[PDB]
Symmetry: C4
Subunit: 326 residues, 4 copies
């Protein structure tokens, strides 16, 4: 009923306001800012950087030509050599600047030995060009390689389920890899999200309470080839210990699930997230299998990935009742 | 007898099917897609990107020339200046485009000050060229540096063995580094792979059960210089606790072994994998030593790396029988 | 009263002296040195590298021209071909060098087929140019992407507080993310900093004593969306166990707090730090909430991020007195 | 007496032999191979790649010219247009190739519209040039950024010491950072290295036995600002439990120490190593302090970093005798 902290696709559902000093901080952390903005604006920013550098140096070569008399004798002759051949106006100056900085250098417009200032500006523009190119290459390479995109080829089940396994009542969900390339050093986390009032009267708008999936024995670390069903044993230390089927069907909470690991090609950590509201957890269900053996290999049928089937033998009471009654 | 989850060389033996939305996901995660495809196709993709950009701008300069009258007077004269000198047909237009975007700029074909649209297109093509170059550099650099390749210079023993060490029955295998450069933050994992039916009747096509190699004390973390024999103590918490030599010789299961760590040069995590079927585990054997001391250094003879020798004193019963009988 | 180990902004307050061999070590670890120096000097270093390479090759082409007779016949004729057309003096030689190495190549100054040494030098200069460009690109890209900058968009509360939660006396501080992009694999640490004399009489100028915030259960690992209040339970193993409110108000110590995690875009680890002196810890206070629900989402009001309010019911004695008395 | 596994500077003292398939493996893992070889050879390899590509395309343009008749009419005329202007011999062909691939493009030698094959080869050479440049940039950037170099600005003490602290006998050594930039996520390890025969008679040429420095409580994780003395408590689980001062002075073993963490600028993990032979451990000594307070900051005097002073009260018996006697 209460709206969700993170959406089914992993997007977090929180807006930040009154962050009054954000412009100064985003400027101080400019690179992060640059790679976070969408492609349109980042490429526009670098376009502007090129345009502005080309125009500035264009203006300088035009002024050098103006003062030297080159606009009146752009090709030169036996008794007059221009600072830069064929700068006859602002457009030609702009072209020479572009041709120099891009290093295209068609050469109709061409610096001469005559003016030390012109030679110096070609030196400076060349160095500046290399600097700007380096910034652009770096920004583009970083934005290209962003590992959050890998979450698009990782899959959480639409539902979580509650069912008995090896004598214990467990909360379960499924994760899968949609590529042949791996997620290295892969590991899973989960949290129960809900508001809470402490015994001292402190209101916590959204508390984040750990859902144990094996950390203490390193069993949170998974080797993900075929889809794996992640298990949370509901025992005396679980926050779901006193939750029966009926409680679940009239409760208001959210289970956030996280898969973290490194994109194999780049070794860069991605964080894939999803969320199960109380109403999206199916008590007394198990996932249909997807893995089956063939002649010389195994195969995964992903069309059954999200499918569940009901298990009538599943206890309807809480895990606490299971121990209390026994 | 049943076919293997991962091959001796670490390749996983699972095919994915009915992943109906894969094209849209692979497009959304395009960079991962690009660096995963083989060199042939990635380089072909970038070749096409260059060709297409060169052709498009080629067409634009040709059209500008056509409409301006330049095809009829490509060199210009006292009363007529072309938008781009020497564009006399489509091939010349294409050459000018290539020369501009690559920044070769031979300069026979050369933009003039005459046409604002031509100057604008040189600006746009230059920026576009830098963008495409940046994408290619990024993709090539990423594909070049892929740390999975480092597994080619890491070595697992062909067999695992079962033998007594310091009073305990242990499953053992060997790992080695085939370079002088290190694997930093190196650590080991193992899993027993087999189908299983739970007491509730749930069939698990392939369950993955942890094989303890010291995680709980940080002893899974290794300093790998000379080859190390990795040890799994078969005790009451091991899934091999009730497995005797005879059981092993008529059993059907697989032990997957993993070595993870960072390539020293790049600090990028590699995951090296191998596999031991029940029939590839040699009960009552130990590995021959490879390390020996010389005058001023140690030496490793890798020709004995895979070699084992039998130990007749090795108990033939399970670890459970060892405790039960004593 | 005693001055602080780390400042409120995370900067460490320690100077190093008599590090006599630092120049040799900084040279051996040159890349780290280069990316650590400020932008001004790094860009100046690369400017000098370009200038020096351009001048050196400039000198070589000038000498080739001098010895070949080209200074007297720079354009050549029917019976004489220069090594490089239009090298008529040192400035022209310098221009040709720049034009070759930058790859601008205007082409007025142009190598010919005549002199094998000139052709060889163009080959060598081209390769050298690519090497220097590669070093510059690498250095700039690394310096641009430095993840310490991300700490500018992470926020620690100005104060820490001491208050009761769920029946325990806890030291608390707040951390927040000032961007929509995440800090992946995020985790927290804290240390109490103070001088100490051991029972053996050894003086420790500043000892660093761990402040437990959940490491042993993996609860130091956080999922940071909206601001989180980090909790240190003051129990029998805490170094604050015997510290009452009055002790705190007349004590001399510092609590350093650390948030580490990976910048989402680059997966590069950042370390954000802050510090609370004894006098900056507010006994009997709690943080005002910042998170509230709207129609379809949650919102964080960062203007209340640092705000606290007093809780008169808070015990004034130490946690040790709480157990001792009960 | 027995020679050391790792040298005082961290270099490992082990040679590998009879690695018969190493060439094929080093080729399969070519990038690692390339960045591991010294600068001389890596830069030579890329030099050769340029030379070979320039020569090959040089040969192709020469052959095109030869067959087309261009060698006899290199400048062309009203009734004859060459494939590439001014290719009059092999050197000119080679120059055109260089000028095209480097993108210098002086333009005296210049492709025309005449020959589709010549245009195609300029296309192919341009793409090939970009590919080779990308490989070189990637290799150089990777080699430049190698984090092992950071170990040159990290420091281990020359000696380790044994002394009492807070009532326990401890093995101690010192680590320091020689830069203002940090080692993030820093943590320490240690191992005792020696040969061993198991109770079953198995000879282990060099066993590696963990030296506990706090892993189980996360105290192996350090915040390294000023130099820190790392502590190993010699208790019943330590391999040094039964080692007295006299034992130490006539024993043969080695303690390897490791500091791992991320270079702040690049977030790349470095591994710094050192070693203490039994004879390099000073029983009954402590390190001189280096940290002292000034007016507004702290200062570290690194000239006392390695210095120790004797503590006559230090027990001379083993830690086992300390408990056994008490
Ligand atoms: C160039 C930076 C672009 O990113 C900006 O980041 C701001 C900081 O996150 C956002 O403001 C967001 O956060 C502010 C918090 O001060 C609010 O005032 C704004 O309403 C809210 O859109 C803003 O939209 C977004 O374009
Ligand atoms: C450009 C992307 C190239 O990679 C593709 O990835 C697909 C997705 O993994 C593969 O299809 C594989 O997976 C599909 C699952 O939907 C099956 O339909 C195909 O038979 C199977 O080859 C396909 O071969 C492969 O070229
Ligand atoms: C080029 C390297 C620039 O970095 C240098 O690093 C030195 C090494 O950290 C600093 O010296 C610092 O450390 C030295 C320790 O030997 C002291 O002598 C100096 O006074 C102190 O400024 C010095 O300022 C700084 O420019
Ligand atoms: C290009 C690769 C350069 O690196 C090579 O690596 C080899 C593999 O490590 C070394 O051989 C080393 O290892 C071999 C093991 O097969 C021995 O045969 C050699 O004697 C020993 O120098 C060899 O020196 C070294 O140049
Ligand atoms: K160029
Ligand atoms: K040119
Ligand atoms: K533990
Ligand atoms: K000309
Ligand atoms: K370039
Ligand atoms: K990188
Ligand atoms: K880690
Ligand atoms: K050029
Ligand atoms: K030119």
């Amino acid at each position: 009923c209460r709206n969700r902290f993170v959406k089914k696709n992993g997007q977090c559902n929180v807006e930040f306001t009154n962050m009054d000093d954000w412009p100064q901080r985003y400027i101080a952390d400019m690179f992060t800012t640059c790679v976070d903005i969408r492609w349109r604006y980042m490429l526009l920013l670098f376009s502007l950087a090129f345009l502005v550098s080309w125009l500035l140096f264009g203006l300088i070569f035009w002024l050098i030509a103006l003062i030297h008399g080159d606009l009146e004798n752009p090709g030169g002759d036996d008794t007059f050599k221009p600072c830069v051949l064929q700068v006859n106006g602002f457009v030609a100056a702009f072209l020479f600047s572009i041709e120099t900085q891009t290093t295209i250098g068609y050469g109709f417009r061409c610096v001469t030995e005559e003016c030390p200032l012109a030679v110096f500006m070609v030196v400076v523009q060349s160095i500046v060009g290399c600097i700007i190119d380096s910034f652009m290459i770096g920004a583009i390479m970083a934005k290209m390689a962003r590992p959050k995109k890998r979450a698009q080829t990782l899959l959480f089940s639409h539902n979580a389920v509650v069912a008995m396994r090896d004598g214990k009542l467990c909360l379960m969900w499924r994760v899968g890899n949609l590529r042949k390339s791996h997620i290295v050093e892969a590991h899973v986390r989960a949290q129960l999200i809900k508001p809470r009032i402490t015994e001292e009267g402190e209101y916590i708008p959204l508390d984040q309470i750990d859902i144990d999936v094996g950390f203490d024995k390193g069993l949170d670390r998974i080797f993900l080839v075929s889809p794996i069903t992640i298990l949370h044993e509901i025992n005396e230390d679980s926050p779901l210990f006193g939750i029966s089927r009926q409680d679940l069907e009239t409760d208001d909470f959210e289970i956030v699930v996280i898969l973290e690991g490194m994109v194999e090609a780049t070794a860069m950590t991605t964080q894939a997230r999803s969320s199960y509201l109380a109403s999206e957890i199916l008590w007394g269900h198990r996932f249909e299998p997807v893995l089956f053996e063939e002649k010389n290999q195994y195969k995964v049928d992903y069309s059954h990935f999200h499918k569940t089937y009901e298990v009538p033998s599943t206890p309807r009471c809480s895990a606490k009742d299971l121990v209390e009654n026994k």
